[PDB]
Structures are given as structure tokens and as C-alpha cells.
């Protein structure tokens, strides 16, 4: 029904702003069959999907063709792609909004002030059935945005105050490798810990055969991503991309203290825990040595620690009588002029 853009049409756009988009309908059909959205959204007729950085908009056309949700809103402001979106999707149920997803205000200015797109709030015990988020942040510049949203999952403030909102994210293969790194791997870092604590992310598709060697060998077995090649994505002058299905899970820990402890433990990610806890405060090594009976945990490096152990160390930190002020952990340099 909806006129899907073709290769002969998306080839005329001059500027893509570093983003890469997939345009082969066969790969989208395979992906949407693998996702199996029908086993979680019982009634797509009552579904609202917010699509961020649509770009060419081929995914939106296919998604609307297969399911026909009641509201499908595209947020795009980049002029070169906005012209194409406006011209191609004229006289269509899809509504295009000329706002920039980067800004924090726009969401509020579009959901609360003027009620253009108001979703349906649900409880925090099941995946929301009236709200889906689809995002394409592929450029190397727009990597902090993923982390900001991933922390907003923990804060339950940006779009996750409605519940456990599911997101389908297109992101560079390096970001996927960093996020989906199991403990002990070379790519382990603080973003992996955040993904472990807040999300249950499953890799769906990846646009390179060799990039699978970086990922965990075992976990791929449980996923079996839809492998394709870099010939079905138009701006081939970039890096391999990947698709992930993110959905929040419940947790019970102090977010701020856990954040502080993980941030200050993952700096020295390869030094053993025998002497890395001395950096969490004045005389922290002795206190943490006194309160950890088992000498086995004091042997594992922070790159080998599972999020449960991080929560345990956070709990130890919170009961420390002499814990430092985590609020004043910043450098003021432009602000400070010393006489």
C-alpha cells in the first residue's frame, strides 16, 4: 500500500550526515520475521510507534505495510533527508514531524505541551503493548546519545516512565561489540555493565561476516543473527552496522552509588581487586579488606566482575561510615581561577 522508496530514488540524495541505512526489502522481511512482534503485541491496531532518525524511511514503509499501526510518527529535521521524506510520503497515513530527536525539550514539547503524540501508560511488570521505539543512530558522532538513553532507562524519566518500552536500535558494529561484551572479554567496559544491569539486549542482524569474531562465541549460538553484506546499504563508505532489541528489566540498587563505584573501578580494569579499591576513597583498601571474608573475590579483576558482584561492592560501599561525598567528584577548570 504505502509507496516504499527504491534504490533508484534514494541514490539522488547528496548528504546523509554520516548515517547508513538498509534498503533491501528482503532483509527487512527476514528481520521482521525473526523479531516476531506478533507474540508480544496482541493488538497492533492500538499500537503507537515512535520512529527516530528515519532517514530514507524504507523501514517505516514496510513496518506500516505489515502491521498498520494506528499512529506512526517520524522525527527528522536534517534538511536533505527531510525534503525526500516530505516529497515521497505525501498523501500517506505516516505523519512526518520536523523536530530533532537530540534535544531533550522536543519530546516534552511534543507529548505534554501540545499532545501531538501521547502514548498509553502501562505497569512495570510487562512490556508495554501500546508503545514501541525505533531508532537509527549510526553515525560515529552520535554515540553519546545511545548512552544517554541507556541511562534514562535507569532513571525512568525520558520515555521509560510509561513502562518497559521496547526499542529497536541501529548502531555501529563497534558500539554493539562494546555493549554486548560478556565478562572477561577484551571489549568489557562500563557500558557493558550498564547494558547488563538495565537491559536484556539480543542481537538481531549484523552487516558483516567477520565482525562476528569479536562477539562472544557462545552467545551467537543463542541468537543466530541474520548475516548479510555491505552491498544492501547505500552509503558504503562507513563501518558495519547492527540491530539490537532492547527492553528494560527491573532492578533494586542505588543507581548513584553503583554508578560511582563502577566508574571508579573500571578505570583500572586490569589491576587485581587486591589494590584497586584503594581509589574509591581515603583508606578504602583496608575497609574493603576487612569486610570481605572470602579471599577469592579479591583476586578477580574489574574486567572479570559480574554485575551482581558490582552490586555487592556497592552495598559494601554504602555501609561504609567514612564514605566520601560522591556529589563533589568533578573538575572545575573554566569555572575556577586561583589567585
Amino acid at each position: 500500500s504505502v509507496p516504499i522508496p527504491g534504490i533508484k530514488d534514494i541514490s539522488k540524495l547528496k548528504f546523509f550526515y554520516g548515517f547508513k541505512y538498509l534498503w533491501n526489502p528482503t532483509v527487512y522481511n527476514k528481520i521482521f520475521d525473526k523479531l516476531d512482534l506478533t507474540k508480544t503485541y496482541k493488538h497492533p491496531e492500538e499500537l503507537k510507534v515512535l520512529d527516530l532518525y528515519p532517514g530514507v524511511g524504507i523501514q517505516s514503509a514496510i513496518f506500516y505495510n505489515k502491521y498498520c499501526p494506528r499512529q506512526y510518527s517520524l522525527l527528522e529535521k536534517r534538511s536533505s533527508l527531510y525534503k525526500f521524506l516530505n516529497a515521497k510520503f505525501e498523501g500517506s497515513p505516516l505523519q512526518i514531524l520536523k523536530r530533532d530527536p537530540y534535544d531533550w525539550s522536543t519530546y516534552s514539547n511534543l507529548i505534554d505541551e501540545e499532545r501531538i503524540f501521547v502514548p498509553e501508560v502501562q505497569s512495570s511488570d510487562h512490556i508495554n503493548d501500546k508503545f514501541l521505539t525505533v531508532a537509527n543512530v549510526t553515525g560515529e558522532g552520535s554515540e553519546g546519545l545511545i548512552m544517554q538513553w541507556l541511562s534514562c532507562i535507569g532513571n525512568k524519566n525520558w520515555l521509560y516512565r510509561f513502562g518497559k518500552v521496547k526499542m529497536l536500535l541501529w548502531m555501529p558494529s563497534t558500539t554493539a561489540r562494546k555493549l554486548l561484551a560478556r565478562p572477561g572479554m577484551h571489549s568489557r567496559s562500563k557500558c557493558s555493565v550498564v547494558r547488563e544491569a538495565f537491559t536484556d539486549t539480543k542481537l538481531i542482524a549484523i552487516s558483516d561476516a567477520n565482525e562476528l569474531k569479536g562477539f562472544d562465541s557462545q552467545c551467537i549460538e543463542e541468537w543466530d543473527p541474520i548475516l548479510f553484506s555491505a552491498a544492501e546499504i547505500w552509503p558504503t563508505k562507513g563501518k558495519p552496522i547492527a540491530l539490537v532489541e532492547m527492553d528494560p528489566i527491573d532492578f533494586d540498587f542505588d543507581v548513584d552509588n553503583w554508578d560511582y563505584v563502577t566508574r571508579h573501578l573500571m578505570i583500572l580494569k586490569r589491576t587485581p581487586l587486591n589494590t584497586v579499591m584503594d581509589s574509591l576513597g581515603h583508606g578504602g583498601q583496608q575497609y574493603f579488606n576487612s569486610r570481605i571474608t572470602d579471599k577469592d573475590l579479591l583476586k578477580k579483576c574489574p574486567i572479570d566482575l559480574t554485575n551482581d558482584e558490582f552490586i555487592y561492592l556497592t552495598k559494601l560501599f554504602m555501609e561504609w561510615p567514612f564514605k566520601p561525598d560522591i556529589l563533589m567528584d568533578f573538575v572545575d577548570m573554566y569555572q575556577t581561577e586561583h589567585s
Binding site: N157, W158, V255, I267, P321, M328, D329, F330, D332, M333
Partner: protein, 918 residues
Amino acid sequence: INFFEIYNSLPTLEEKKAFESALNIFNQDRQKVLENRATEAARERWKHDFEEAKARKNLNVKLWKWYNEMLPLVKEEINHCRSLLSEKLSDKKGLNKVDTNRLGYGPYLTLIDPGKMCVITILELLKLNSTGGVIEGMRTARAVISVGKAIEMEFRSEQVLKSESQAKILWPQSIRARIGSVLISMLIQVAKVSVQGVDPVTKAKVHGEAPAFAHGYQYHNGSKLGVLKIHKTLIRQLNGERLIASVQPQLLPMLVEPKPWVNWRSGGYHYTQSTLLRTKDSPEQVAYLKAASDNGDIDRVYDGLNVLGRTPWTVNRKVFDVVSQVWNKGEGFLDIPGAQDEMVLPPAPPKNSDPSILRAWKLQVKTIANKFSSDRSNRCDTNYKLEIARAFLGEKLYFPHNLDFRGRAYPLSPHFNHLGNDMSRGLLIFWHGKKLGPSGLKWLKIHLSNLFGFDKLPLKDRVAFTESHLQDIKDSAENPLTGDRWWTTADKPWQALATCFELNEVMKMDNPEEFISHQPVHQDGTCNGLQHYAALGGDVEGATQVNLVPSDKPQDVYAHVARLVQKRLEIAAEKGDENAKILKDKITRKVVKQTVMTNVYGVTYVGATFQIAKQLSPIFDDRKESLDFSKYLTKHVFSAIRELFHSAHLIQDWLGESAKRISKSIRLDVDEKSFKNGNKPDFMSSVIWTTPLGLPIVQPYREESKKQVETNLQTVFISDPFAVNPVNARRQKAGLPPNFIHSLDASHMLLSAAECGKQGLDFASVHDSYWTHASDIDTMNVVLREQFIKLHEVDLVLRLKEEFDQRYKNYVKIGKLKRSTDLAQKIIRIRKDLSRKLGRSTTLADEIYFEKKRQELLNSPLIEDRNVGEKMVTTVSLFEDITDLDAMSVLLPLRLPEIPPKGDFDVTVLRNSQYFFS
């Protein structure tokens, strides 16, 4: 004994001079003792306080505990190094410390006494507090570098003392760091402090011992930052009553006449040697300064520095009493923040709030923390000054000076000097006292009117102001505290207090002309930076607007801009605007001063916004995080002054274009052989010119060549001083317009200082502000006008253009031209010539190298040899036929633009203008 009390009691100048000479001969020994055996005094004070506290100031007790406990570890560490050096060779050693590390810093530890090393490291760590931007600590690299440099300075003072008593050259920064790292790594484990904590669960208060310092990391915008942090207990100890002897400066003011400047590396302190220039980062500045000092081109710089240095000061007495009474009160005063224990933070917003709200709250918390720390720093610095002036009360002290790379003079004593804030300027007077005479009384009245913010009115108005407020002067001078405190309303209170003191003593007498007054009287240049542009381009309107031409009333540029912005806002606020109504009457010459000042220096929009935002807070027209008014105000300021300074902007743009062209030039010698890194070469030519006083000015802006060197704590990211790097083409174009004018101002100050010193006055200068006795103001003013006329009588823009032309003769730029343009076409024919003789296609490096030898051929003394070389036509030599160079890639000559036209302005006419300096 307070010698200043004796000096004033003597009847005649003969006895005073005899006493002063004997006093200098006596004070030589005191200075010699002070410079060399100062740290032993701190050790003695620590030990004494510990013994007194043990028999029956808490900071002094702890310091001896650490130093006496750190000392055993240093004696063990040095012994291990000597064992490895005792054996000549050992091939197989553990990579940890003995293999290379203890061999690396082994010799450098053995030099000085271990107790001295402990004292230096403790003092250096305790001095570096809240520096580098760490909230309650310091940056690790700066700490270790400072410790190493202090160790080296102690070694060279001991060495010179031994050499002059019995009868590498400079440590690399890869060695200075390791010594500091070792010492600090010992001190971290040695130090202990007692802390009180509250249990979170059972709420039971407990005590404990925790290390005083700790080492951690922090992140700013995706980059780690190793930091050293101090326990809060030490911090709250460092804000107590007073700190008598624990941290004493190593570079405090002299007791005798300073060593006169006779060479670029000899002068100032007796046992300590200081370089003329402060900028020790670059070696090229050192090379050029050595070259200019060898011949002797900078005798006038020496004369000015010598005149500035040898002015004797003495600490004010009554003002010190008043400050001591205010400090003991323990409450916040005019500028002393007062002892605050716990700071205040607003309640945190609910975590469900929009992320923008949380970000704004975090910004507010950051702002509040900077104020509380900035206030604590101010209080601690005031306490330190009150310490320094305490031991120097009734003493003769001299301030030697040196220069930055442009020429501005700065005292060597960093903490207590006359360049400090208002309070520091208040605690200093002149030892030599002059009778007021017929003019000193009037000039002192004008000085008080100046300090009270009313220095924009004619002289008669200022004298009338002071004569009217004589009653308040006496009231505030009799009882400064528990009175009406009229001196607190002044713009500069801690100097108006001393002025009121002196005026009260004068008016309690019957003959003003017999009083001896030690109070310095300032004379600050009005719009000095624009005065130099007015005198440079010869603009008559600009000269009128900056009080150059003779006049009757003071004129200024900043008040004009303030009025323009005020009427702009008033028009805007009358048409329904909301922010303009608030700022309708809050615009004064102080708010819009630095933006108008630095417009002709190249200030950016964000820099201007932060300038005006910083200026708003003292009048609290808004709060600290209400910076959104500043954006509006800066937009209006730029719009208002878009079409004001046109003669100045021409010189600014000429200097900018010249710097941009120089920064992209290549000389023929440097491109001797292609580096093979790429077809494009590196640019290594900086901007260099000479002061009208002969001093050379080299801009030290080059790309960074930092690297990570391992230490015992971490791996510090430091630079290589000896490395030469391509110039920073961004900072060479941005620093010339300010650097040239500041060098001009410094040269004028040096000339005036030298002449005034020859004429016998007591002189002391602060950039554009020149101080002297109340009875010497007329002579000083005549000298100012005469020296400004001497400086600016010769054309300086044209002289700079000629100097650049004769300094960058054989320099080549790289550009582009059309492949079909006939001028560019002919080079392609030359590009075809090398295909046979050289055997390969002509390239950029080869084309440049061709002209290198031809310059030798041209300058061959033989006329026959000149004909051999001069006949050749190179690619560069094509452009010599024409001159219109403005309208592939081709080499081009380095041609600098034409100087802006000079107006018809006579510089001598200002010699009768009495508002040029006031």
C-alpha cells in the same frame, strides 16, 4: 625591634642616611641566613611545638610526626640505590625497580639530605591545595613536577653556598618526575589522620585513623586525570586561626638592595639566580634573549628594571592592626569570606524528572561548589598574607622584578607584593618620606577622591569632594571600627583607609606643608590600549576620545558605550521586552569595560559573554546561574559598538593578516631535504619583532609534543622542553594584536621608570598605573608625557613592516593557480625541464631546493661568480617581473600587506593635556 619607628624619629636626613647604611650592612647577614637556612627553621618550629605539646598549633604537632616517620623510609630507599651502583654491572635484574628504575633516579636521590627531602615534599604538597581544578586536592603531574623542581633548586642553592664558602646542567623532566613520585609515594603511606564517622545502620558514632592523602582518578569530557586528594580534616585544619611557620614561602621579599640587572641571567636574589623572562617553556626565546644580551642591546630594559626593583617599601602599621582586629572577629567582612563550615545545596529533584532538569540541578551544584571553594581559597590567602606581613613588620623590604616574554614587569615575590588585591595594596607604604609642599596636600585629596570611585570628574571637583567629606574622613580615621565606617563604602577600602589615616593626621596639624607622607599616589592611564592605537594610526577622533588632545573635562570611551547600550535597552524596554526592563539601569562603565577593551584585541562572543556574566555577579543584578541575561547584554554591546573603532580595527586586521601570512611561510634552509613524510612540508616560522627598547619578542606558540613517562604512582603526560614543533597557526594569528600593544605599554613604562629614577623620585608601576610620592606627581606627569612623546614620535607600524620585510626576505608561501593561466602556465614548462636533467618530474621540494643555492650564488662576493648564478630563472624568480600577486599548486613569495594610512595627528600636543594620566 621595629626600625621604622627609629627612622622617623631622627631629626635630619644625615642621621637617617647613616642609619640606613649601617642597617643595610647589618641586614646583609640576616638576608644571607634567611635565604639558605629557612627550612631548618621550619623543622625547629615543628620540633619545638611537638615538645611543648608533649610536655603538657595542632597542625605543627602532626607535621613533625610525619617527618620523623617518613625519614626512616627515605634512608632505606637511598641505601638500596647505592647497593646497585656499588656493583659495576649486573645483566639479569628484576624489571620492577632494580633493573632500570633504581638505576634511573639513583644518583639524583643521593645528592641532598633525606630530612631536607622530607621537608620539601611535605611543604610542596601542603602548598598545592585546590589547584588544577581538583575540588579538595591537586593534579598528580603538577605535584610531582613541583616537588622535583624544588629538590633541584635546593641542590643548586646548597652547591653554590658550598662553592662560595670553601674558597646534568638542568635535570630532565623525565627525571624530575620520578623523584617527586618516589617521595610522594612514601608520604602517602606514612601520613595518618584521625577521622570521626557516623554509622549508617546503627547510627553509632565512631573514630578511626585514615591516610591523610590519597591518589585517585577523575574524568573531564572523556579524559582521565590523576589526582591527589586531601582528607577533609586537614582542610578544616588549614582554615584555623593562623599558620605561623608551617608553610613559609621560599621566594619572599628581600631585606637589602636587590642585585642589579647587568645580564639576562644575573640579577635579583643573592643566592638565587632568576632568568629575565618568565616564559621558560620555549628554548627559542632563551636563544634570542641570550643573543640580544651578548651584544648589549637591552641596556634600557636593565635600567628600567633596576629602577623599579630598588624602591624600598615598608609594612603599614595601623592598617595591619585594623585587619588583625577584623580577622579575629571570625565573621565575613568587606572581602574576607568568613569561616563557613558546611555549605548549602538545594534538595535534589525527583529522579523521574526530565533529564534537562537533572542536568540544570547538576550545573547549579557545580556553581555552588566553586563559590564555596573560591571563598575558602580567598580566606586562606588572606591569612597567609597576614602571616607574611607579621614577621616583616617594621622591616625594610625590596621587590625585585622580572619580565614575561613581552616586557611587562612583575615582582619575583608572588604572594605578598603590591600587585595583589586591594588589601595587599593597603599594607604597603614608602620608607622614604617626602614633605607635602604646596601640591602634596591637593594630590593626596585627589588620590582619596580617586579611591572613592569618583575619578572621572575634573580635579577641582575631586578636591571639593574631599573637602566636603573631611568630617567623614576624620570620623572613619579616628575609630575605624565601631564608627560610621565610611571607608567601607569606598570602591577600594583598604587603601582609602590608609589615605583617611594620613589626611586625618594632616588636618590635625596647622601647617600641612611640614608633614612627611609615605602614602603612594596612583596615576592610571585612561583607555591605555586605545591610547596606543590612537597614537599609532594618528587618528584625531580616536585621540580626542581617549584624552590625548588637551581638554577641560575627562572623556572616556567606556561611559559612552554604556550610555549607548542603556538607551538601546530603554528603547527596547519601551516596546514590551521583558529582559530589558530589568537591565534598564544596571548598565555602567564597569559592566561594559572589558568587552570594549578587548574588542580591539579579538575577543570572541563566548569570551565576551563570560566577561559580562562575571561582571554582573558583584552587583547581583541576577544570580550566579542566571547567565542568560549576559547573552542578551553582549549581543547589544556588539551591536552598539559595531561601528565605533575603525582606525583601530585597521591596524588589528593588518597585524592579523601579517601573522597569518608569516605562520604559513617556509624558508629555503629548513626545507633542505624533504622529510618524506608528505608532499606538503611543515611550517616552523614564528612571529618575531623587537621592542623599541631593543628587547626581542618571540611568540612561543607551537604544537604540543607530549608523551607518557612512567612513575611510581602513574604514567604522567608531560612535554619535552627541547622539542621543536610546527607553530600553532591559530595562536600566532590571535596573539599578535594583544602582544604588540602590551609590549608597547611595557616599553613606555620602562622608559618612564628609568627617567624618573634618574630624576630622583621613588617609583613603582602597575602596568598602566604609576605610583610616586604625593609631592612628586607634577614631575612624574611631565616625565610621562615626555616619554610617551619620545616613544611615539617615530612611526612604529611602518618600522614593524620594514623589520618584518628585512627579517623574512627569502621565505616562500604555497598557493594555487589555474593550469591555463599564462603566469602559472610558464612554470609547467619549467616543470618539464627537470624531466631530462634530473630524470624525474619536478616536485615542490626540488623546486624549493633549487633556489636555495642560487641565493648563495647571488651573494657570492665575486662579480664573475654573480653572473654565473644570477642569470638563472627559477619558478620563484618568475614573480619578480610583476607585483600584483593577489589575483595545481605553485610557490609564491612572502609579500606582506600595505600598512593602513596614517592620519595627520601631532603627538606633542598631548604634553599640555592633564587628563592623559589621572
